[PDB]
From a paper:
To understand the basis of neutralization and escape at the atomic level, we used cryo electron microscopy (cryoEM) and X-ray crystallography to determine structures of the two mAbs: TAU-2303 and TAU-2212. To summarize, our study provides functional and atomic-level structural data on the interactions between naturally elicited antibodies and SARS-CoV-2 variants.
TAU-2212 is one of the most potent mAbs in our panel, and while not being able to bind soluble RBD by ELISA, it inhibits ACE2 binding as measured by flow cytometry, suggesting that receptor binding is blocked through a different mechanism to that employed by TAU-2303. The structure was determined by molecular replacement and was refined to a final R/Rfree of 0.202/0.246. No significant differences were observed between the two molecules in the asymmetric unit (a calculated R.M.S.D. of 0.77 Å between the aligned Calpha atoms). Fab2212 is not able to form a stable complex with the prefusion stabilized SARS-CoV-2 spike ectodomain, but interacts with spike trimer on the cell surface.
Author numbering:
A (entry chain H): 1 to 140, 152 to 196, 205 to 225
B (entry chain L): 3 to 215
Amino acid sequence: QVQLVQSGAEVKKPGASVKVSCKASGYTFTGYYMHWVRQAPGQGLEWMGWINPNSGGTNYAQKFQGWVTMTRDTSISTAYMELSRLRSDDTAVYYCARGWATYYDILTGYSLFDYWGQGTLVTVSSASTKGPSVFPLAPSGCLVKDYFPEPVTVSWNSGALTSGVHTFPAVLQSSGLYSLSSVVTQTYICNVNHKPSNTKVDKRVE
Amino acid sequence: ALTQPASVSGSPGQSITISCTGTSSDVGSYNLVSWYQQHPGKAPKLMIYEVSKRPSGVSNRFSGSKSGNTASLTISGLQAEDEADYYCCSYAGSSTPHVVFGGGTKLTVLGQPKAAPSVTLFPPSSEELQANKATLVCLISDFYPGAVTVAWKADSSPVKAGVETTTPSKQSNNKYAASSYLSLTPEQWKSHRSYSCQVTHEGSTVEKTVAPT
């Protein structure tokens, strides 16, 4: 069916620029309006603008004017969004969502944002990409500490240990580094994967 | 924006209505009001479009109306799966056509039994200590509702510096969980006889204690 796929999560230092892509499939690209909507983590939704992929005509929300640039390449049916001079408070999941048809006399309906992409989390901070420090919580788990950026993935016994494991949300310390802990309820080994920094660590839990 | 109610509650198998107050330039002028339901970790899902109309594979339980300058979404026959964030959207622009969204509404599906939290305290690891660092971890994992307060004590007396706490969050069990961290120095850790994690939940505390000896 209709599937929108967006590019990978990007981590950038304030003042830099980013380019996000939105691959369309299962529909005629030039047929439908292509909108962008961002959501700050745990915050509400914010409309930014639409592009007519057919004509190329653009419309920005007032507070998105002057730094947001939207283009499209109909050859590969991919919409592009270029954010310039990024600020810390511009950390959000950036979504592309399909509008209604692009011709004057409208068939079907005005089904706005009937289909969304998976999102692009654009993280901006003065902090640098930091690999985590993992420590075992001995019994009477693993503490995953001091990492940026967020994600982080914790496997147990090379991923064999699946039952009783609980992974807690991360806290954003004053350092601007994240910290989470995952708890386990013969030999137990710790395998934490930090994809954004390409870091893996092994640790033992005795 | 349009002004939406921050939070709405109801009991299972009943109906509620979520307002979405706009101006004459949006909801008043156009019959292009849409509603979206967003679950945690997932993009929003089109539920309602053109004020009243419903997409294919959305349940009949989701009705849409609009009177004057305010929109409303009614969910008949409340199920547990309906617990999510509900945004309202409308076409705007007298001579400048734009899209505007709503501030959002968290719907709570009542009935889930109240559960006292379950506290676990881990001491600093010796291998963390060898890095000239020490951290105590407080995990609260099996409580409803999802409102807790954590407070740290060193030798019975309150400490508030180097506390990094998470806001509570739901689990697979559909019971809320929070974590608390106390970042110490090895000097502080060794120099005290006890360290405590007091978790208050609806007028009641569960305190766990750990000792460096």
